[PDB]
Design a protein around this ligand. Structure first.
Ligand SMILES: *[C@@H]1O[C@H](CO)[C@@H](O[C@@H]2O[C@H](CO)[C@@H](O)[C@H](O)[C@H]2NC(C)=O)[C@H](O)[C@H]1NC(C)=O
Lengths: 55, 173
């Protein structure tokens, strides 16, 4: 895509009274938004090519 | 089949009997007609229904495949995971196919057995009071009115009541 540099992304789960500490002096791609895991349940990532308003 | 009745010594079923699986066709002076043996029919219905329900029941703890994703350097466990899934899918497909094949065979022979038992139920009542035609039919050595027909059908045949008139009719023969 025109770019010859690379970006490497990382993730972690931050437990409810824990804290995450970033320290950087460059090349940092900073979080702005994170995601609260509100509902854990049984779900799935279905690989499909389709997109039906039915139930 | 296994018991020699269905498509055996009774060569053919009756389109005419429609209120059950097994039963009787009588023929006297008052007239003829088909009737189902309610008791042996209900027993078979209960047996087959429990069988069907038992087969469906035994399969509730069957394997359920789950989507799992892997990357280019996880090809081994990807393949392991696939073999595991196909592995159980193949086992349970065998189990369902085989169970159906095996119990089908037993079911056909079960009906054969219910029929052969019904024939024997009548035979053991009639004894020498009737002649085994050898086709599922018994020719009586006495007069069997509709009420008498009903006694054979509900297992209350009074053998000695007809014993004498039967014996006399056997001996002029
Ligand atoms: C994240 O924030 C909370 C709250 O400001 C910290 O929990 C406090 O911890 C002290 C002891 O260090 C307790 O006596 C307080 O009552 C706690 N407050 C609450 C509101 O629960 C927590 O330890 C912080 N975590 C880090 C990793 O800094």
């Amino acid at each position: 895509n025109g770019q010859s540099g690379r970006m490497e992304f990382f993730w972690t789960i931050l437990k409810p009274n824990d804290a995450i500490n970033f320290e950087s002096n460059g090349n940092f791609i900073a979080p702005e938004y994170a995601y609260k895991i509100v509902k854990k349940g049984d779900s799935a990532i279905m690989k499909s090519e389709l997109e039906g308003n039915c139930n | 089949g296994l018991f020699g009745a269905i498509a055996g010594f009774i060569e053919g079923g009756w389109q005419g009997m429609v209120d059950g699986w097994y039963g009787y066709h009588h023929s006297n002076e008052q007239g003829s007609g088909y009737a189902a043996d309610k008791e042996s029919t209900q027993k078979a219905i209960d047996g087959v229904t429990n069988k069907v329900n038992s087969i469906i029941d035994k399969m509730n703890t069957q394997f359920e495949a789950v989507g799992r994703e892997f990357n280019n350097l996880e090809r081994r466990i990807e393949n392991l995971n696939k073999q595991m899934e196909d592995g159980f899918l193949d086992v349970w497909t065998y189990n369902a196919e085989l169970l159906v094949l095996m119990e089908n065979e037993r079911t056909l022979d079960f009906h054969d057995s219910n029929v052969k038992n019904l024939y024997d139920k009548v035979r053991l009542q009639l004894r020498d009071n009737a002649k085994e035609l050898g086709n599922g039919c018994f020719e009586f050595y006495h007069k069997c009115d509709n009420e008498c027909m009903e006694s054979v059908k509900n297992g209350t045949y009074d053998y000695p009541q007809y014993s004498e008139e039967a014996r006399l009719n056997r001996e002029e023969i």
